[PDB]
Structure 1
Amino acid sequence: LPLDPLWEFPRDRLVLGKPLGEGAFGQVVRAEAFGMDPARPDQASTVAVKMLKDNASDKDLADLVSEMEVMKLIGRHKNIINLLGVCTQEGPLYVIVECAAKGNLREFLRARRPPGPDLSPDGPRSSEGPLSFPVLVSCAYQVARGMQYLESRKCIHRDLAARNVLVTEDNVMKIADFGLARGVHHIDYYKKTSNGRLPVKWMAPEALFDEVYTHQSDVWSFGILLWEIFTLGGSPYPGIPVEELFSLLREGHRMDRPPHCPPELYGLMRECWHAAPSQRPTFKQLVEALDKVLLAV
């Protein structure tokens, strides 16, 4: 690999820490970095480091290099996980990115569900959970802003889901993945992850049936992500196995309106799931629509 002085970071300024997850596309580890800002060479910061698994092949390495190159090109935005540096010289390939201290959006919501009626009232805020409507709307708005930026850079995500949105210490939403060379020509549609996820449930129909991905396919997934947010991390198409999902999508089945969700937001969900990709909103329109809701509250 050639040395790119713009992005290269000395590997000896990293102290690797706890693994944050392994996947098909490598492994991600928490690390401490010293002097990420060259103006403060001894300053510590917490970053995340992507690297190859133990017995990885050439395709795996090419896949990670491909990811590195895409991230260089994408540039910086508040609502995406940003590239910080790379280690390409004299040792294993490292791709260094921002660390989002609160983990992924799905787990963030599920850990913050309101207290149930089993509660015994204790103090003046027994009924008040950590999550409020305007903050949920702000989460959706931020994801839409990041997706609008990604679309402007001609980037199609292809697995937009709450699992792939990360949450910073300041509750800022950051689109990640946790994928890139997604192998769209050999998806196991029946795949269930170790946490029980069925990723086929986020795919637009034209992607699933016709293997066509566009920015409007990501808009479909965003609708699913909106449903995730307003169910506080619920699993889509509850109780529906993959075999039945296929036939229900062919009949044009859509998820019901979830409890305690205003019609404005179920309205947006159903717009995102219009059969014709051209009749779904663009991310620009979703940003504007959610902004209006945010201002009203």
Structure 2
Amino acid sequence: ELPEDPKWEFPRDKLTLGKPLGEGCFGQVVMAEAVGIDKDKPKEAVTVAVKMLKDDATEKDLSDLVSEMEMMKMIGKHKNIINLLGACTQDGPLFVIVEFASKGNLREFLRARRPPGMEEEQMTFKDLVSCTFQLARGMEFLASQKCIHRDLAARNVLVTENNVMKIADFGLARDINNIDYFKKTTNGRLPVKWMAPEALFDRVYTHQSDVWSFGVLMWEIFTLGGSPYPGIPVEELFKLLKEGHRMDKPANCTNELFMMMRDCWHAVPSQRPTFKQLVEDLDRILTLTTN
């Protein structure tokens, strides 16, 4: 029932499962040591992350984990994407082997480095811009691979030992050319506070709906891991989005970067910047920083 793909298959006896990285809703992720995984360096144990099902897994949990594996095969290598390293798909549970990011998700990373008195090492304004630029490059790459993430948010970004930002969690990602999928998708399982109005109301997913999400990701970054639409329950966001409600400027944010967020949140999707435009604009801001 699981697909065979010999070029991605990693032998189970070379994989040593270690500490769980969090107890998980639709699966479990565990630290592991993989010995041959780097073909250049056989006999060398690489620390990896292994996504697998839990005991109380649903049919949909297995579907989603297979889809996530296949979506990662279809997406090329990029510096700012969590890349597939391998899979165990035969004579046992499904293991999807991905790059370990030692510093965890970006939400927790930002929150851990907050200055005191909002209610370890601090991030500079330049660091937050570097972060945003890196993620813009990741999404420009994804858009070019015909991939809509649909679940872009700080909690779905991972940070490596070298502070490289990596887009992760491709379980909800779809090919923009998947007509049949988009024609029948009923009730959304995308966090409402990160959804483009057209995605929320009309079930329209494009790279431009990902750009809206990127704007919320920017807001998350410049609030040092704040929660969007603070004090507004999801229940009331529906009505507020239709009336053109938008978030206000974070503390760690210039008017320039806040106007970019506002552009990301244009009512008309084609009037939002492309990721390509976001990479160029952010590059210019990063080089003009003047610490």
Q: Same fold by TM-score, threshold 0.5 exceeded?
A: yes
Paired AA for residue 203 in structure 2:
E
Partner of 2:65: 64
Runs of 4+ in structure 1 displaced over 4 angstroms? Answer: 181-184
**After alignment, is 20-29 or 85-94 more displaced?**
20-29
8 Å contact kept, 2:150–2:173: no
Give 1:178 shift: 6.4
Give secondary structure in 1 for the equivalent of 2:55. Answer: coil
Letter in 2 for 1:156: I
**Which residue of the partner structure matches residue 30 of structure 1?**
31
Q: 2:166 aligns with which of 171, 174, 185?
A: 174
CA contact (8 A) 1:25 1:178 kept: no
Deviation at 1:245, TM superposition (A): 1.3
Larger mean CA deviation between 152-161 and 259-268 belongs to 259-268
Letter in 2 for 1:285: Q
* 1:88 matches 2:92: no
Q: Tell me the equivalent position of 2:53.
A: 52
Aligned twin of 1:249: 241
Partner of 2:32: helix, strand, or coil? strand
Shift in Å, 1:173? 0.3
Q: Secondary structure at the match of 1:25?
A: coil
- Closer, same or farther in 2 for the Cα pair 1:39/1:243, shift >3 Å? closer
Contact preservation (8 Å) 2:192, 2:200? yes
| Residue equivalent to 1:161 | 153
Cα RMSD of the aligned pairs, angstroms, is 2.1
Q: Which amino acid aligns with 2:127?
A: V
Q: Does the CA contact (< 8 Å) of 1:81 and 1:97 recur in 2? A: yes
Determine the structure 2 residue equivalent to 1:277: 269
- 1:206-255 C-alpha deviation (Å, 9 max, x unpaired): 01111111110000000001011101001111111122212211110111
User: Which of residues 129, 134, 148 is equivalent to 1:142?
Assistant: 134
Aligned partner letter, 1:110: R
Amino acid at match of 1:79: N
In structure 1, how many angstroms separate the alpha carbons of the residues matched to 2:278 and 2:77?
Answer: 21
Q: C-alpha deviations, 1:24-50, integer Å up to 9, x for none?
A: 432211111112123433211110001
Instruction: Tell whether the 8 Å contact from 1:112 to 1:130 is kept in structure 2 after alignment.
Output: yes
Match of 2:195 in 1: 203
**Alignment check: 8 A CA contact 1:28 1:49 kept:** yes
Question: 1:264–1:38: structure 2 CA closer, same or farther, 3 Å change rule?
Answer: same
Name the SS for the 1:18 alignment partner: strand
| 1:266 pairs with one of 244, 258, 262 | 258
Percent of counterpart pairs with the same letter?
75
Equivalent residue pairs, number: 279
State the secondary structure of the residue aligned to 1:179. Answer: helix
Secondary structure in 2 aligned to 1:174? strand
Shift of 1:62: 2.9
CA displacement at 1:138 relative to structure 2: 0.5
TM-score by length of 2: 0.90
Paired position in structure 2 for 1:121 = none
Q: CA deviation at 1:11?
A: 0.8
Q: Could you tell me which amino acid in structure 2 is paired with residue 166 of structure 1?
A: L
Structure 2 CA distance for partners of 1:266 and 1:145, relative to 1, 3 Å? same
Equivalent residue letter for 1:221? S
Confirm or deny: 8 A CA contact 2:151 2:173 kept in the other structure.
no
8 A contact 1:25–1:179 mirrored in 2: no
**Partners of 2:114 and 2:205 in 1: CA distance:** 34
d(CA) in 2 for partners of 1:137 and 1:107?
18
Q: 1:288 to 1:93 in 2, by over 3 A?
A: same
